[PDB]
Design a protein around this motif. Structure first.
Motif, PDB file in Angstrom:
ATOM      1  N   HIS A 128       5.061  11.850  -3.683  1.00  0.00           N
ATOM      2  CA  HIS A 128       4.280  10.692  -2.717  1.00  0.00           C
ATOM      3  C   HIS A 128       4.247  10.671  -1.522  1.00  0.00           C
ATOM      4  CE1 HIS A 128       2.988   6.821  -4.639  1.00  0.00           C
ATOM      5  NE2 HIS A 128       3.114   6.402  -3.352  1.00  0.00           N
TER       6      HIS A 128
ATOM      7  N   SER B  65       3.098   8.386   2.079  1.00  0.00           N
ATOM      8  CA  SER B  65       2.420   7.425   2.716  1.00  0.00           C
ATOM      9  C   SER B  65       2.019   7.927   4.172  1.00  0.00           C
ATOM     10  CB  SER B  65       3.337   6.130   2.806  1.00  0.00           C
ATOM     11  OG  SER B  65       4.796   6.735   2.942  1.00  0.00           O
TER      12      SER B  65
ATOM     13  N   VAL C 291      -0.249   2.276   8.128  1.00  0.00           N
ATOM     14  CA  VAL C 291      -0.453   0.921   7.706  1.00  0.00           C
ATOM     15  C   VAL C 291      -1.331   0.232   9.027  1.00  0.00           C
ATOM     16  CG1 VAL C 291       0.412  -1.241   7.351  1.00  0.00           C
ATOM     17  CG2 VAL C 291       1.489   0.746   6.362  1.00  0.00           C
TER      18      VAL C 291
ATOM     19  N   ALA D  75       2.126   9.947 -10.293  1.00  0.00           N
ATOM     20  CA  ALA D  75       1.858   9.525  -9.057  1.00  0.00           C
ATOM     21  C   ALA D  75       1.011  10.361  -8.115  1.00  0.00           C
ATOM     22  CB  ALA D  75       3.394   9.726  -8.438  1.00  0.00           C
TER      23      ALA D  75
ATOM     24  N   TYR E 197      -2.415  -8.317   1.792  1.00  0.00           N
ATOM     25  CA  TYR E 197      -2.699  -6.955   1.397  1.00  0.00           C
ATOM     26  C   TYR E 197      -3.080  -6.850   0.026  1.00  0.00           C
ATOM     27  CZ  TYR E 197      -0.531  -5.485   5.982  1.00  0.00           C
ATOM     28  OH  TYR E 197      -0.192  -5.340   7.192  1.00  0.00           O
TER      29      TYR E 197
ATOM     30  N   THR F  75       2.792  -0.393  -1.398  1.00  0.00           N
ATOM     31  CA  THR F  75       3.024   0.851  -0.686  1.00  0.00           C
ATOM     32  C   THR F  75       4.575   1.166  -1.220  1.00  0.00           C
ATOM     33  OG1 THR F  75       1.628   0.006   0.968  1.00  0.00           O
ATOM     34  CG2 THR F  75       2.595   2.272   1.453  1.00  0.00           C
TER      35      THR F  75
ATOM     36  N   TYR G  22       7.785   0.886  -6.537  1.00  0.00           N
ATOM     37  CA  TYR G  22       7.566   1.631  -7.926  1.00  0.00           C
ATOM     38  C   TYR G  22       7.902   0.507  -9.215  1.00  0.00           C
ATOM     39  CZ  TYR G  22       6.167   6.180  -6.769  1.00  0.00           C
ATOM     40  OH  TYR G  22       5.794   7.623  -6.533  1.00  0.00           O
TER      41      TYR G  22
END
Ligand SMILES: [Zn+2]
Ligand SMILES: [Zn+2]
Ligand SMILES: [Zn+2]
Ligand SMILES: [Zn+2]
Ligand SMILES: [Zn+2]
Ligand SMILES: [Zn+2]
Lengths: 585, 187, 586
Positions: free
Chosen positions: A164, A166, A169, A203, C242, C246, C249
RNA sequence: UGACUGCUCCCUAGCAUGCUACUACCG
RNA sequence: GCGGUAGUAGCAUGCUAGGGAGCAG
């Protein structure tokens, strides 16, 4: 710190403080650049700032130079003279100043985002050194904006092929991984070797280019160096040489080419030359020709990438000695096949990245398209050769103009090497219609390359054409095309020999997803350097803006040998083109 | 000067005298034309020679007070650097072998020259030549200061790792000789 | 001595004195708050005062400059200079000056002597920085009012559960109850020696704490007031809706501990902050346990404010949760040490506001927000700043121990910023599923403020007993007594077998201690006893005034017992709005 | 990485005194 | 006709501070 105001050719020692590259401006550029454009800051051998505990008035506005330092107005130890007065700024060379009649250079380019059409078009009507500085400011603006982006990281190691990621933001994040991400890692407080990773699918499925060992917390971010100043022009005046004296011609002459002795004599009595060559137009086999015919000639060979060098190096060691090439490797994709760490030879190859400057005699480079004048200038300053034979094409695989906001400019108005040709005329005749077929050559020389190539080889009536409009359906972040890939697959099943091709597409995610149920290797579009193959599946989209804007991929069609597959949804490139038309089932 | 409280008189006296020049002025009004901007001008100059002194005085405390601030901010950055030292050179006292000699002491005072000699874990030996090496540090273990130490590393002057087989009687001319042996305590 | 103007944040160097804590008022802003109030003294890098021979003239506004020291009019040197003039007090950084139209609140906040409710109304209508300054100065004035007490000198002790203590001359006896934990520090010869956590009972004397010290000669009992640190980080952050989940899980399976919790995840995971508005005994103790296990891939923390209320969070923790997988913190104040201590790396952290490690997180719970002052939220946000947090608690409970306000009652909304921000824009949720509770509380709180939005679940068997006894109140000394309470309790247990194994509630601990000296009953707290309610309880009158029982004190006290609730009327309390059973007293 | 003292030349900023002209009131 | 008083500009001396450099033990 005594540079040069090449906006005037004046030798000065100042520079604009809150400016892009902080370049050298004279007492007559840095006088008017500050008053209109708010660059209330100049940099000298010592910065023009207050010099008294706590002061925060740093504006070479009315600052007065006294007592060996620059004081201010608000608190006044005035007893001196202002820094800006009588149409000039104080500094060395305050007497030997020339001035400029084009006042609004910085006023137009130092405030904009370095992407407007007007800036570019007025740039292409400037001199050689001002445009060299404009190209260095384009590289500098790209690198400045390179540190205003996101950063990747991994804080949790998971099982392979399922991780995963990220990024960030609430900030304005697309990037055609073109140059891939090699950051460096961290474990507790120091830096740890990680290697180079490639993120294409996601994922989140992860592919592997090479075996590595993930650690907890590893970051990824790119650091790019600053392009150093160069000291050589890009183009050169036309000046025919006296004779072909000073060369060592050879008794033997090739006979499979009927346009070899004429062009040899031409380059003998010509100094510099430029052409418009599509892939396979002499870059494949004529370099070996000039190599064997001109032995003593110090011919330097370089491409923008080692992969276009590979195209000539593969067969450059069978007919000719292995030791005839020499490239250096750093300690970009390459391979250690040749004799590295040997910068002394007669046919010393070269690289855009780095190479020591010893000697040269003949200029011959491969495709020079994916860069601005920077490439021409770095190769003219790296080595200065007697003769110039520019192989390739200025508009072949052009560098993407960073952020586009206002359409796309007309190819005719390129930096330096396209408008000169189509305002004076072609210099040399050259064409290799051996690999390429005629079905492509006809249209390519009908559009832009009128009366340059002949239809030598016939067509086996294999090209695929089917007018399909389709339906597009966009989403919040992507879009998947249902009709066209499906009809392509349905057409491929009708031929038994169609499972030995590649999977190349404008978008990497599309073909990557579609390969999970067909089983085809992943491929992308950055530059098909010296890599010609028979079968291929071509696509586009988003046409309208990303694909159907201009003929960005006209030369790129010439990779096949007996036929290609290139569907199109418009009515501008088939008005006379004769791809076999058929109807859907 | 636009706020000095003596600009009104000066301004008015100028107007009365200067502006009234075209108009016929006798020899008696001329005194008013002369001795009215005078005296007022003297006072204004007096009101400007004191303002100039107050300004400078003022701009000698808005500079001497940035320096009293600077120094205190600095006094707090060194007061926190010696503290971060005297608390990092303390977490390093094997307080089992150190509380065993401060305890056997008569009053708790001991010479300082015997604390690294009897309560340390590492030994560093600097050796000039080969003859000195075989009488001080022969083999992988040696005794010094009524203890037994086992060799762990032998760097040299250049700080490159040497092995205990490069140190011969005849390979010695081929080593940067101030040799530094690092050894650990045994048992 | 250079920092942010409490108000404008620009860099200043000044700082008043009136303001006990001494903030860094900017330049300009001093001209407002300096002249516009008794507040006069000023201290910049150097202090301002007529340096002239032992003078005593201050109010900078009058003091003048000159030389390099300052002099008002005292003896202003010929080359003086008004220190005070053009809206600005001479001070470092004068052009970054600005000031801001905010001396408004600032002046009311500065001038507010904190005696009436208006102090809290005006304190609660300002901006973020003003809110922080007001909370800090409120805690400051309250602790410096509270430390106005002497010492207790002790030389001998007879035996256990007995001690002859006497306060100083002119200083009254410190208050009875345990809300001010007696953390004393005696002296041996030069420094402060530890005593232990103590608490008084009466003027026999049962020690309800867990400690034992060798008290004897020279013992000095004191009340320890900790020097409060300045608050820096904000108490909140504006939210934003939002769409992308993010990091979080959701589990492959369904942890079907509860049924309505699916709506809890649907409604809470979307916005940047929310609050679990749960009625008493309707899941206000173990919904966060469900959120902890439905999101195992998210860092989750729990902070608390009281040591007592650790029963529910611990019993099920041992029943169905591990030991090592959780983590606890205790310094060497005192609490259970079952779990791992000193572990900065864990997924289920329990901690209390006394001391926390500097770290960030992504989901936190904050139990008993209603007991916590704005300073508590700000300090728990500064010491541990995380992305999202949920405030366990409900505004419909008792007020915080603000002994500074007496005459006027404390409305919910003005408890804190959250207990009103959640009223204005609307509550984020509302629950009505009482796990283990009859529907008597359900009907009561639906009639009172819920407007009958949640309905009766369990049958109303009319087992609750209410009578018409009023009682008589009388005051003699600092501690209070109630003569019709020693006999009323006896008269009520005369023939009732059911409550022979019942507990005693203590609104006023003095009367309970007296009755336990007369008869003998275990003491139970009223405020720090939420979730620790026994099955079978008796509600006593215990008071006849408006000091504690006016509107919002019985809502949680009439739901302690499970099956047998005997709650006698004590005042004009809702008596003639519903019906009630009644056992006829003999 | 750059110790403690002493002497001495050159440049800039501030303070007071010393012969003058300019102002202006005052004799 | 002269003296005193308060500003302003100009030339040297000494002293107090800051900065750069040279020598000696
Ligand atoms: Zn600039
Ligand atoms: Zn110039
Ligand atoms: Zn200044
Ligand atoms: Zn104040
Ligand atoms: Zn005084
Ligand atoms: Zn302010």
């Amino acid at each position: 710190a005594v540079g040069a105001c090449v906006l005037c050719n004046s030798q000065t020692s100042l520079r604009c403080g809150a400016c892009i590259r902080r370049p050298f401006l004279c007492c007559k550029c840095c006088y008017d650049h500050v008053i209109s454009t708010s660059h209330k800051l100049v940099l000298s051998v010592n910065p023009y700032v207050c010099n008294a505990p706590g002061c925060d008035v740093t504006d070479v506005t009315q600052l007065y130079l006294g007592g060996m330092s620059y004081y201010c107005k608000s608190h006044k130890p005035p007893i001196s003279f202002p820094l800006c007065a009588n149409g000039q700024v104080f500094g060395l060379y305050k007497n030997t100043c020339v001035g400029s009649d084009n006042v609004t250079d910085f006023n137009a380019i130092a405030t904009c985002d370095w992407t407007n059409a007007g800036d570019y078009i007025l740039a292409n009507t400037c001199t050689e050194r001002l445009k060299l500085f404009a190209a260095e400011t384009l590289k500098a603006t790209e690198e400045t904006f390179k540190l205003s982006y996101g950063i990747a990281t991994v804080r949790e190691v998971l099982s392979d092929r399922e991780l995963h990621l990220s990024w960030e933001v609430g900030k304005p994040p697309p990037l055609n991984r073109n140059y891939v991400f090699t950051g460096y890692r961290v474990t507790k407080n120091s830096k740890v070797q990680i290697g180079e990773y490639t993120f294409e699918k996601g994922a989140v499925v992860y592919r592997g280019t090479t075996t590595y060992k993930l650690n907890v917390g590893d970051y990824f971010v790119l650091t790019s160096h600053t392009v150093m100043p160069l000291s050589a022009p890009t183009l050169v005046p036309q000046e025919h040489y006296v004779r072909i004296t000073g060369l060592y011609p050879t008794l033997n002459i090739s006979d499979e080419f009927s346009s070899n002795v004429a062009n040899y004599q031409k380059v003998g009595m010509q100094k510099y030359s430029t052409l418009q060559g599509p892939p396979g137009t002499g870059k494949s086999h004529f370099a070996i020709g000039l190599a064997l015919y001109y032995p003593s000639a110090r011919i330097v060979y370089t491409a923008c990438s080692h992969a276009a060098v590979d195209a000539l190096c593969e067969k450059a060691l069978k007919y000719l000695p292995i030791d005839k090439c020499s490239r250096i490797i750093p300690a970009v994709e390459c391979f250690d096949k040749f004799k590295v760490n040997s910068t002394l030879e007669q046919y010393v190859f070269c690289t855009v990245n780095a190479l020591p400057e010893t000697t040269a005699d003949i200029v011959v480079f491969d495709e020079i398209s994916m860069a601005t004048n920077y490439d021409l200038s770095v190769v003219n300053a790296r080595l200065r050769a007697k003769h110039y034979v520019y192989i390739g094409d200025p508009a072949q695989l052009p560098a993407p103009r960073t952020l586009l906001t206002k359409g796309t400019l007309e190819p005719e108005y390129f930096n330096s090497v396209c408008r000169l040709m189509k305002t004076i005329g072609p210099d040399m005749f050259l064409g290799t219609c051996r690999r390429c077929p005629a079905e492509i050559v006809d249209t390519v020389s009908a559009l832009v390359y009128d009366n340059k190539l002949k239809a030598h080889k016939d067509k086996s009536a294999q090209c695929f054409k089917m007018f399909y409009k389709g339906v597009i359906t966009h989403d919040v972040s992507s879009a998947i095309n249902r009709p066209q890939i499906g009809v392509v697959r349905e057409f491929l099943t009708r031929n038994p020999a169609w499972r030995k091709a590649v999977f190349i597409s404008p978008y990497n995610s599309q073909n990557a997803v579609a390969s999970k149920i067909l089983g085809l290797p992943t491929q992308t579009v950055d530059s098909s350097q010296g890599s010609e193959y028979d079968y291929v599946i071509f696509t586009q989209t988003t046409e309208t803006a990303h694909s159907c804007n201009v003929n960005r991929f006209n030369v790129a069609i010439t990779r096949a040998k007996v036929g290609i597959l290139c569907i199109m949804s418009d009515r501008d490139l088939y008005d006379k083109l004769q791809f076999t038309s058929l109807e859907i089932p | 000067f636009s706020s000095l409280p003596s600009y009104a008189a000066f301004a008015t006296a100028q107007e009365a005298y200067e502006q009234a020049v075209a108009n016929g002025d006798s020899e008696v009004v001329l005194k008013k034309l002369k001795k009215s901007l005078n005296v007022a001008k003297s006072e204004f100059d007096r009101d400007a020679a004191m303002q100039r002194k107050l300004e400078k005085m003022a701009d000698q405390a808005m500079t001497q007070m940035y320096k009293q601030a600077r120094s205190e901010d600095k006094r707090a950055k060194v007061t926190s650097a010696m503290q971060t030292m005297l608390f990092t050179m303390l977490r390093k006292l094997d307080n089992d072998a150190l509380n065993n000699i401060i305890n056997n002491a008569r009053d708790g005072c001991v010479p300082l020259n015997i604390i690294p000699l009897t309560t340390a874990a590492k030994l560093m030996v600097v050796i000039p030549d080969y003859n000195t090496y075989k009488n001080t540090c022969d083999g992988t273990t040696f005794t010094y200061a009524s203890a037994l130490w086992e060799i762990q590393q032998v760097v040299d002057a250049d700080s490159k790792i040497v092995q205990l087989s490069e140190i011969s009687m005849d390979n010695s001319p081929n080593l940067a000789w101030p040799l530094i042996v690092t050894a650990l305590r045994a048992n």
